[PDB]
């Protein structure tokens, strides 16, 4: 529990942009990456469990958290390839070394799994949850939000997201089992208080999801790391959720097939970090300890 952020935000300029992140401690980094429509804040009650286990880092994706907005912004801004271009340069700047443990969720898993494949030699371990593990079909998508997501990927997505901020105000609270506090909702809605383009990142993300073959570039990237992950001996901690949301059904069947993997299930829907922060935190800290004996 806790509405307070973990650590203090530091800033660094990337491709003329300036991105925000948390960088606490020393040693090999334990990289936590949030997805849509959150920020580093999502890991505020989990990162504490890893204290003294390494350099704890949580980056705010471009256009998200305290990171700068891209401008001009529009229907083509914030696609996956653009977020990766900024995340790659941010991770390079932070001098992470070659024994990085990745802790990912949602789009962070898409970005994390991809970076991991491209930089496999540098990856010590991967702890993932409610992730985009492979390209999917609509039938694999959580039914309660299926029509809503098909709507984000239609001309109605602009009104829903840019005008009404649906992903932050409806999706987020809706996929967390416990009632959030006033301060916790403030921290999540802060980067998107302004109607219009400031919220563009939270609409471009659902349009990037590799569902029913589109978009093709993202599908290919996901087909890429899913293939790789299924055969990689890199240690993995799969934090499964009940009832879970995204990583259930076929995708979960698939993830349960990955090598050298430890699994645990915690209570939660999608943004499970809000429902079982300590169960998740404890597990990750244990995972890292076994990966870093001493
Ligand atoms: Br999304
Ligand atoms: Ca070293
Ligand atoms: Ca429908
Ligand atoms: Ca709820």
Swiss-Prot record:
* Top-level enzyme category: hydrolase
Write out the catalytic residues in the record.
106, 130, 270
Residue positions annotated to bind chloride are 36, 107
Noted pH dependence of activity: Optimum pH is 8.2.
**What induces its synthesis?**
Constitutively expressed.
What Enzyme Commission number(s) appear in the record?
3.8.1.5
Pfam families from the xrefs? Abhydrolase_1
Note whether Transmembrane occurs among the keywords: no
Record InterPro entries: AB_hydrolase_1 (IPR000073), AB_hydrolase_fold (IPR029058), Epox_hydrolase-like (IPR000639), Haloalkane_dehalogenase_2 (IPR023594)
Record GO terms (molecular function) = haloalkane dehalogenase activity
- The keyword Hydrolase is assigned to this record: yes
Q: Which Gene3D superfamilies match?
A: alpha/beta hydrolase
Please write the reaction equations for the catalytic activity of this protein.
1-haloalkane + H2O = a halide anion + a primary alcohol + H(+); (3R,6R)-1,3,4,6-tetrachlorocyclohexa-1,4-diene + 2 H2O = 2,5-dichlorocyclohexa-2,5-dien-1,4-diol + 2 chloride + 2 H(+)
Q: How does it assemble?
A: Monomer.
Q: Which PANTHER family match?
A: EPOXIDE HYDROLASE (PTHR43329)
Q: What does this protein do?
A: Catalyzes hydrolytic cleavage of carbon-halogen bonds in halogenated aliphatic compounds, leading to the formation of the corresponding primary alcohols, halide ions and protons. Has a broad substrate specificity since not only monochloroalkanes (C3 to C10) but also dichloroalkanes (> C3), bromoalkanes, and chlorinated aliphatic alcohols are good substrates. Shows almost no activity with 1,2-dichloroethane, but very high activity with the brominated analog.
Name of the protein in question: Haloalkane dehalogenase
Q: Which gene encodes it?
A: linB
